[PDB]
C-alpha cells in the first residue's frame, strides 16, 4: 500500500513539474534545487495528510535531493562550463530508476548502520595502560623512524636494478648498494626496538590486569564466593586477562602505520583528481556496515567461548581437587567424559567463530575486487573522454587502492581490538564490583574488655534470604567466663560464630563489642582481637610456621613454639622431617585430622585474642587431648565461646546457651 | 576445523593422563598447578601450532 | 590401604583371598565403599552426589532408600527443591552431619561388601546416630557385608564384634569389649580417662 | 628454557589464586587478603623478570 501510493504521488508530482509548473522555475542548478524542494514538500504534505510518513519519510529527502545535489558536486569538481543540467521529471526513466536504487541502497546501509560499552571498556583499558606511557612513546618514535627509512630504501633498490639492467657503472652500483644497506639497517634496528617495546608493554598490561583482578576478588563479600565457582574465577583470571592484552604488538603497529600513511595518500590522490577521489569513497559505507555486523557476531561468540572455557576449567578443578574421592569410587572415566563434553562445546564455539571470520574475509575480498573494477571502469571512461592521461590514471589507481586497503585494515583492526576487549567483560565487572559489606571501620582501641552482646539479632543468608537462620537471638559474653553454645545440626551455631567475627551482617538487631557495633572496628584489629578455631580447619600449603602465624606480619619463633606447646601440637611437630618448617601440603593434606585441629588451635592462640570462638574445636581430637584442652583456654581476661554439638565437656562452663532452629531457649 | 579437533583431542588426552597417575602425584603437584598445565599450556600450544 | 589408594610396602592385603590390584577398578570400588573423615561433596544436585560413579544411573527409589538408610531423607525432603538442590562447590549449604549423611547414603547405594566408616559418626545428630547403629547391628543386610568402623564414639564400639587398639601404627591389643576391659590395658585407660 | 620458566611461574600464580579463592572465610577471618595479594605479586614479579 504505502509504496504504491508513494510511487503514484511521485509520478503525479513529476508530471506536474514537467508541465507549466516547470516553466516558471529557473534553469540550471537553482532550477534543479527548487524542483527538488517542491518535490519534497509535495511528498511530505501528501504523506502527512494520508498518515503514511511513519516509515517512508526517511526515504523522502534522499530520493528528492539525490539528483540535484549530485549535479552540484559535479559542477563543483568537473566545472560548470558544461551544458545546464536537465530537470528530474524531464530526464528519462533510467535516471529515476537509478535514483530509486540509490535511495533504497542508502536506506538499507543506514538500517544496517543504525557500542558505548565497548568504548567505556576500551577507555578503562587505556587507564590501566597509562603507567606504560614511556614505552608507548618510545615505540611510536621507533615506528616513525622505521617508516621514514622504508620510504628511502626503494629509491636505492631501484637504482641498483636500473644499473644492473642498463649500463653497469661500478661506482654507482657500489654507492646504491651502500645506501640501500644503510637505510635497511637503520629501519630494521628501529623496527626491532619498536616490537620489543610493544611486547613488553603487552606483558606489563597483562600482569597489571591479573594483579588488579585478584586484589579486587579478595575484597568481595562471602556471598560472592558462594554464588561463584573457584575454577571459573581462575579461568577468568588466566584467560580473559590474556584476551584483554593479546593484540597490542601487531594491531597497534598496523593501526599506527595506516594512520601515518592514509592522510598523505589522500592528499596525493586529491592532487591528481578530486573527482575520482570523491568517487573512491564508495567503499566506506559497505566496509563499515560489514564490519559492524561481523563485530557484533564476533563479540557474542567470544563471550560464549570464554564461558565454555570457564565451565571446562571448573570440571578440571573439581576432578583434580577431589582426586582421592573420585578415585575411591572408580569415577575417573566419568570425569574424563564430562571434560570431553565441555571441550566439545568449546570446539563447536571455536568452529563457529572461525567460520564466520573466514566468511567475512571472503565477503570483504569480493567487495574490494568489485569496487576496484568499478573505479577502473570510471577512470578508463574519464581517460577516453580526455579528462586525465594514462600516467595520472595509473598513479591515482595505485594511490586509491592503497588507501582502500589502509582504511579496510584500520576498520578491521579497530573492531578486532574492541571485540577482544569487550569479550572480557566479566574481568572488568569483577574489578568494578562493589562488595556488599559495610564501610570499613576505624576503631583500634588499645584496651579491649571483650564484652560481646547480641541484641535481637536476626540473620538470613543473602544467598537464600527467604529462609531465616537466627530469630531474635540476644545474649551477653563476659570476659573471664565461659559460654557454651549447644544445639543440634542446622541450629545456627556457626552462623552465630560468623556474625561474631563480622563475616556477615545481621539483618536485624546488633552485635556489639565493648558497647559499639563490631562493624565499626578496623579489619585487622578486629580479626586480631576476635579469633576462631573453625569446625573443619583449613590450612594452606607452606611451612607449619606460616600456618601457625598466618596473617601476622612479624611473629617471632618463640611465640610460634609457645603456641604449639599450648595447643599440644609440639608433640607431633618435632617428629616431622624439619620441625616447624615442614611443608603441610595443600589444605594440610599431609597431616592427620587431629594434627590439623591442633595446628589450627595453635594458630588461633598465637594472637593472644581477647575473644576466642572454639567452633567444634575438639571434634576430631582424641580423648586425651580433649580432656587436656578442657577449660584452660580462659585466663580471667579472655572471653570464650565454646560451640558444641551436645553437652560434651561443656558443663564446666559458667553460662550455657541452648539454640534450636535459630531460637534461643532459656535454662 | 582440523585445528579445533586437534586442540580438543590434546586437551582430553592430557586430562586423562593426569587422572591416570598415582595418589601421591597429586601431593607433589598441586591442584592449581595441574589445572594451569591442563587448561592453559595446552591452549597456548594449540594456538601457536595453528 | 583398604580402598587401594596406596599399596602396602610389606605384607599383603587380600579381598576374598586375592590382592586388590587383581580386581577391576570400578568393580573393586563399588564392592568396597568408604565414608571419609572429611567427606568430599561435589557441586551437583544431591541426587547426582548420592549416585556418583555408578555406571547405571539409579532410580529415585534406590536413591531415597539409601537416604532413608543413612538418615539423609529427613533433611533432603525438607529442602525447597528436594533431591534437585544444587550443592555448593565446597558443600557449605550442607551443615556438618548432613554432609556425612549424604556421604553415607552415597556409600550405601552401592550395596558394598566392605563398608568403611572413618569417623563418620562425629557430626551425625541423634537420629542419624540411631540410624547408623541400626544399619550396623540390626539391619538384615549386615550379614552381606563386613564393616570397618573407625571411630571414637564408644557407644558403637561397645557393641562391636571385634575391637583393635591401633596405637603408634601397631595393634597393642584386640578382642571383644569385655576382654579388653578385663585386661585393663590401653583400651580401659582410654575409656576411663574422662572419669579420672 | 625461557618459556618453561614462564609456564612454571604462571602455574605457581594459579596455585596461589586457587588456594586463596577456595578458603575465603579463612582468609578474611584472619585479615590476610594483603598477604595473598603479596604472594600473587611475587609470582607476577617472577613472570615480569
Ligand atoms: N553459606 C551459606 N549459604 C546459604 N545457606 C547456608 C550457608 N551456610 C549455612 N546455610 C544454611 O544455614 C543453616 C545454618 O546451620 P549452620 O549454622 O551452618 O550449622 P550448625 O547449626 O550445625 O552449626 C545450615 O543448615 C544451612 O541450611
Ligand atoms: Mg557448625
Curated annotation (Swiss-Prot), chain A:
Annotated phenotype, changing residue 451 to I: In allele TAP2*01F and allele TAP2*02D
Subcellular location: Endoplasmic reticulum membrane
Annotated spans, Part of the peptide-binding site: 285-373, 398-417
GO MF annotation: an example: ABC-type peptide antigen transporter activity
Cofactor(s) demanded: Mg(2+)
Keywords assigned by UniProt, alphabetized: Adaptive immunity, ATP-binding, Endoplasmic reticulum, Host-virus interaction, Immunity, Magnesium, Membrane, Metal-binding, Nucleotide-binding, Peptide transport, Protein transport, Translocase, Transmembrane, Transmembrane helix, Transport
Record-listed ATP binding positions: 487-494
Membrane-related topology note: Multi-pass membrane protein
UniProt main location, coarse: endoplasmic reticulum
Reaction catalysis annotation: a peptide antigen(in) + ATP + H2O = a peptide antigen(out) + ADP + phosphate + H(+)
All ranges on the Lumenal side of the membrane: 72-92, 154-171, 272-277, 380-392
Residue intervals of the ABC transmembrane type-1 domain: 136-419
Alphabetical list of InterPro entries matching this protein: AAA+_ATPase, ABC1_TM_dom, ABC1_TM_sf, ABC_Tap-like, ABC_transporter-like_ATP-bd, ABC_transporter-like_CS, P-loop_NTPase, Tap2/ABCB3
Ranges annotated as spanning the membrane: 1-21, 51-71, 93-113, 133-153, 172-192, 251-271, 278-298, 359-379, 393-413
Keyword match Protein transport: yes
Pfam families xrefs: ABC_membrane (PF00664), ABC_tran (PF00005)
Entry note about domains: The peptide-binding site is shared between the cytoplasmic loops of TAP1 and TAP2.
Function: ABC transporter associated with antigen processing. In complex with TAP1 mediates unidirectional translocation of peptide antigens from cytosol to endoplasmic reticulum (ER) for loading onto MHC class I (MHCI) molecules. Uses the chemical energy of ATP to export peptides against the concentration gradient. During the transport cycle alternates between 'inward-facing' state with peptide binding site facing the cytosol to 'outward-facing' state with peptide binding site facing the ER lumen.
Recorded family membership: Belongs to the ABC transporter superfamily. ABCB family. MHC peptide exporter (TC 3.A.1.209) subfamily.
Name assigned to this protein: Antigen peptide transporter 2
Organism, as annotated: Homo sapiens (Human)
Lineage of source species: Eukaryota, Metazoa, Chordata, Craniata, Vertebrata
Gene designation: TAP2
Curated annotation (Swiss-Prot), chain C:
Cytoplasmic side: 1-196
Effect on the protein of changing residue 125 to A: Impairs allosteric coupling of peptide transport to ATP hydrolysis, converting the unidirectional active pump into a passive bidirectional nucleotide-gated facilitator. Inactive in peptide transport
Consequence of changing residue 110 to Q: In a lung cancer cell line deficient in MHC class I presentation
Free-text comment on this protein's domains from its UniProt entry: The peptide-binding site is shared between the cytoplasmic loops of TAP1 and TAP2.
Role according to the record: ABC transporter associated with antigen processing. In complex with TAP2 mediates unidirectional translocation of peptide antigens from cytosol to endoplasmic reticulum (ER) for loading onto MHC class I (MHCI) molecules. Uses the chemical energy of ATP to export peptides against the concentration gradient. During the transport cycle alternates between 'inward-facing' state with peptide binding site facing the cytosol to 'outward-facing' state with peptide binding site facing the ER lumen.
Induction field: Up-regulated by IFNG. Down-regulated by IL10. (Microbial infection) Down-regulated by BCRF1/viral IL10.
Portion of the full-length sequence here: 550 to 745 of 748
Location(s), subcellular: Endoplasmic reticulum membrane
Protein family according to the UniProt entry: Belongs to the ABC transporter superfamily. ABCB family. MHC peptide exporter (TC 3.A.1.209) subfamily.
Residues the record lists as binding ATP: 92-98, 152
Tissue specificity field: Highly expressed in professional APCs monocytes and dendritic cells as well as in lymphocyte subsets T cells, B cells and NK cells.
Record disease entry: MHC class I deficiency 1: An autosomal recessive immunologic disorder characterized by chronic bacterial infections of the respiratory tract, beginning in the first or second decade of life and usually progressing to bronchiectasis. Patients have nasal polyps and may develop chronic necrotizing granulomatous lesions affecting the nasal cavity, upper respiratory tract, and skin.
Span of domain ABC transporter: 1-193
Signal peptide: none
Annotated protein name in UniProt: Antigen peptide transporter 1
Swiss-Prot record, chain D:
Domain of life from the UniProt record: Eukaryota
Subcellular location: Endoplasmic reticulum membrane
Residues on Cytoplasmic side: 1-49
Induction: Up-regulated by IFNG. Down-regulated by IL10.
Tissue specificity comment: Highly expressed in professional APCs monocytes and dendritic cells as well as in lymphocyte subsets T cells, B cells and NK cells.
Subunit description: Heterodimer of TAP1 and TAP2 (TAP1-TAP2). A component of the peptide loading complex (PLC), interacts via TAPBP with MHCI heterodimer; this interaction mediates peptide-MHCI assembly. Recruits TAPBP in a 1:1 stoichiometry. Interacts with classical MHCI such as HLA-A*02-B2M; this interaction is obligatory for the loading of peptide epitopes. Interacts with non-classical MHCI molecules including HLA-E-B2M and HLA-F-B2M as well as PLC component CALR before the peptide loading. Interacts with PSMB5 and PSMB8.
Disease implicated: MHC class I deficiency 1: An autosomal recessive immunologic disorder characterized by chronic bacterial infections of the respiratory tract, beginning in the first or second decade of life and usually progressing to bronchiectasis. Patients have nasal polyps and may develop chronic necrotizing granulomatous lesions affecting the nasal cavity, upper respiratory tract, and skin.
Domain notes: The peptide-binding site is shared between the cytoplasmic loops of TAP1 and TAP2.
Family the UniProt entry places it in: Belongs to the ABC transporter superfamily. ABCB family. MHC peptide exporter (TC 3.A.1.209) subfamily.
Name recorded for this polypeptide: Antigen peptide transporter 1
Biological source species: Homo sapiens
